Design a protein around this ligand. Structure first.
Ligand code: A0H
Length: 253
């Protein structure tokens, strides 16, 4: 199907691990989209070959307003190319760097959009596992879109749960933890388990050792405390999250 000469390449949108993402336009269509360039060299050296196969396989088959479309793909000699939906308003990450904290209505809305997207993922038995602000994009209307199914599976420590950090076997429940960490970070402006070293953060995650600044409301504290439980079993379902007083009270969607 596609080849590189099918597109005009535009400005760099940002840098990734094995490659960078560019603005691009399909020549015939004048259709605007993001082009993710990966290097066969680096992805072999790190043997993530099998993961890319799952990202491409998984993201290509998902269809949801809050999940970033993968349209197709291709490759040449040196590189692999992902042809992605373009998200005009950037990452939630840069949004967070700019504003410092989010208000309770912006947070609740993102959490809602996120839950929906995740509630759908799980019904198709897909677990993301790598949910973080660099991996959340914004659509033309400012709607949240989950991107980059990198370590997603049909089955740096800041957003991972105790069970994963400690090697153990994990389920759809990892994502509700990540959701808890996100909810906290949106309101406070830094993740609950942040530290100067990986080693400290690890201990802090395993003991679920976090505290709230004074400005965080009882509603926020309750939802977050429910999501951030050491025991996967004790975490709410996506459905209960959507129904949380604090959420329904504050969310616009
Ligand atoms: C500070 S930052 O925003 O550059 N963060 C860096 C970074 C790292 C990895 C992947 C991306 C990335 C991936 N995308 C995919 Cl895939 C589809 N659309 C985008 C997409 N879109 C996008 C749209 C507009 C903007 N800006 C920059 C400053 O504010 C005005 C417009 C940036 C990224 N970005 C961005």
């Amino acid at each position: 199907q596609w080849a590189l000469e099918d597109f005009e390449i535009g400005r760099p949108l940002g840098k990734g691990k094995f490659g960078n993402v560019y603005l691009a336009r399909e020549k015939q269509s004048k259709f605007i989209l993001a082009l993710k360039v990966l290097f066969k060299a680096q992805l072999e050296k790190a043997g993530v070959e099998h993961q890319l196969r799952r990202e491409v396989e998984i993201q290509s088959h998902l269809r949801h307003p809050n999940i970033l479309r993968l349209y197709g793909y291709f490759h040449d000699a040196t590189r692999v190319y992902l042809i992605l939906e373009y998200a005009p308003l950037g990452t939630v990450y840069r949004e967070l760097q700019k504003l410092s904290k989010f208000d309770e209505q912006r947070t609740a809305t993102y959490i809602t959009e996120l839950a929906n997207a995740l509630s759908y993922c799980h019904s198709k038995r897909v677990i993301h596992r790598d949910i973080k602000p660099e991996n959340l994009l914004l659509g033309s209307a400012g709607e949240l879109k989950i991107a980059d199914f990198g370590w997603s599976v049909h089955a740096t420590l800041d957003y991972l749960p105790p069970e994963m950090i400690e090697g153990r076997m994990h389920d759809e429940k990892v994502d509700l933890w990540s959701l808890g960490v996100l909810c906290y970070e949106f309101l406070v402006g830094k993740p609950p388990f942040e530290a100067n070293t990986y080693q400290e953060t690890y201990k802090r995650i395993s003991r679920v050792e976090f505290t709230f600044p004074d400005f965080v409301t009882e509603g926020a504290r309750d939802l977050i405390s429910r999501l951030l439980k050491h025991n996967p079993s004790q975490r709410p379902m996506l459905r209960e999250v959507l129904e949380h007083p604090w959420i329904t009270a504050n969310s616009s969607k």
